[PDB]
Amino acid sequence: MVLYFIGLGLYDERDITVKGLEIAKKCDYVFAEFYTSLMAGTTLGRIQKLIGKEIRVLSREDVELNFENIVLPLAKENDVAFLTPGDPMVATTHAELRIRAKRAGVESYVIHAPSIYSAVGITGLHIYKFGKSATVAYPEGNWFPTSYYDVIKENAERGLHTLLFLDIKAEKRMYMTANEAMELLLKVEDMKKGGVFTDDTLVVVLARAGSLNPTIRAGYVKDLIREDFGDPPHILIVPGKLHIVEAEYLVEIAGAPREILRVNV
Amino acid sequence: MVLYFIGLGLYDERDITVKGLEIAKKCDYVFAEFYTSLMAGTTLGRIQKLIGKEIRVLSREDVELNFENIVLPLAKENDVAFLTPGDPMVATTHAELRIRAKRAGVESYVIHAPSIYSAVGITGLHIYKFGKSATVAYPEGNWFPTSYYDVIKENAERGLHTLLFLDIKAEKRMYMTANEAMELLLKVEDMKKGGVFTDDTLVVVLARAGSLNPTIRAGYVKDLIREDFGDPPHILIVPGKLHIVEAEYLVEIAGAPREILRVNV
Numbered sequence A, B: 001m002v003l004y005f006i007g008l009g010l011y012d013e014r015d016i017t018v019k020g021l022e023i024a025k026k027c028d029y030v031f032a033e034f035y036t037s038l039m040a041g042t043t044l045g046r047i048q049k050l051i052g053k054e055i056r057v058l059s060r061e062d063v064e065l066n067f068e069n070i071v072l073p074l075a076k077e078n079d080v081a082f083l084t085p086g087d088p089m090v091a092t093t094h095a096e097l098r099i100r101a102k103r104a105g106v107e108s109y110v111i112h113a114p115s116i117y118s119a120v121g122i123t124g125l126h127i128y129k130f131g132k133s134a135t136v137a138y139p140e141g142n143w144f145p146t147s148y149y150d151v152i153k154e155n156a157e158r159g160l161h162t163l164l165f166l167d168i169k170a171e172k173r174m175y176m177t178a179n180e181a182m183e184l185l186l187k188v189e190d191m192k193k194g195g196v197f198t199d200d201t202l203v204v205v206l207a208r209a210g211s212l213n214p215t216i217r218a219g220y221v222k223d224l225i226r227e228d229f230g231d232p233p234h235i236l237i238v239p240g241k242l243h244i245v246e247a248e249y250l251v252e253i254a255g256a257p258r259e260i261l262r263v264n265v
């Protein structure tokens, strides 16, 4: 009679919480989805081994179109687990899955896990200063989306930081790199000439958050655009005006140039 | 010679990530602070019991003034862990402690844990729609903080949600409730009269996130300002313009007035 939404965390199989692991182990059935994001530091096999249960993977269509036919049925007579990367309820479409549960007379509970939204705190940037968040999407054929650019403008304009999620073709396991995101933004800047993202813009790159050895680099676009940040996933952030303490952290921990202490504070 | 900042999560000792628990079990010395946030569903004993190590709790002064004299000295010859509620780098000044570690020649690593900053996703409000965050601080003597009121105004102007961390004086065992924060907000409104926070403002209250049964309520201030949301901690959220799906969730899961379903696009 119970459905558990369990977050898997940031990077590998150990990023699930103890509560999530113990509950998953007591569930009769375990489903998982890997279309909203991926666990770059592990595999389905390793998560299955840790949980000690077979995991039925579900596609986007499986969830969005048939969640009530695939998952909820079993939940009326058993304890069922639905695993997702990061924190459940963060992916925009997940919240309403709880409404489907209710509609089906099934109780659901949420077991949280770390998310990039909170994990960026490791960049030394104050979490309260982040504004609206966005996703950098790959242009396609005749489609060139650029709203993520306006989000940066509106946030920076108020001295707020902008968290940028990079495009990901989950199924094909293809990640957009920080380097590509930067190239895209420069191209958008050249189209909109808003002086929002240039070679002089200060940016922060966070790669493999959750790993014990993530890549945290801060610097100007002209210098980082061709730098190697390692394996995915990459998260790009365009900081607003910095507080001296934020700049000190970026310099001492993220290898940023001393120059930011006078130019970006 | 390493220092590990390990998050313990939102509510109880099991909100720690498996990664965090396994590393903590192997640390020679374990320190912790419980003043930046309240873990309502556990005790020091249960945490010590789970980690299998004796935990020395530090006060704000111990950390902010003597971290490099109490903790760092040991991380020079041993593996040391510093535990905190939620995520160690979120809405705290703990990030600066990594700088102290560096200058003391100590390597530090961060292990994330579920945070209230991302757990807000459970309210059904799109997390990418949250703007600048702020804290409702207790008035002290003749000093009456109000900056958080302007944060709400700015976000609302842009149609963004506002996350309000509530004040806490752990030493006095004081935990600001959503009701108290609402009372303070109404008083600020009388003074500034910006039409930002009134009896008719729609708010969302999340209490004891991370527990299996948190309290999630949405409604007008006039009806919620005297409602009992249970034991702390509580966060208050002032939504911006709602998407239809956000409203449906607030009504279906948070018991909001069925009338907010009618959005004035």
Ligand SMILES: Nc1ncnc2c1ncn2[C@@H]1O[C@H](CSCC[C@H](N)C(=O)O)[C@@H](O)[C@H]1O
Pocket: A118, B010, B011, B036, B037, B038, B085, B086, B087, B088, B089, B090, B091, B092, B114, B115, B116, B117, B164, B165, B166, B167, B168, B206, B207, B208, B209, B210, B233, B234, B235
């Ligand atoms: N489980 C919980 N439920 C509701 N609010 C919570 C909460 N945990 C923390 N908070 C809120 O956040 C404030 C502390 S701010 C420190 C937050 C912490 N680093 C984290 O990652 O969560 C509290 O006063 C409270 O208003």
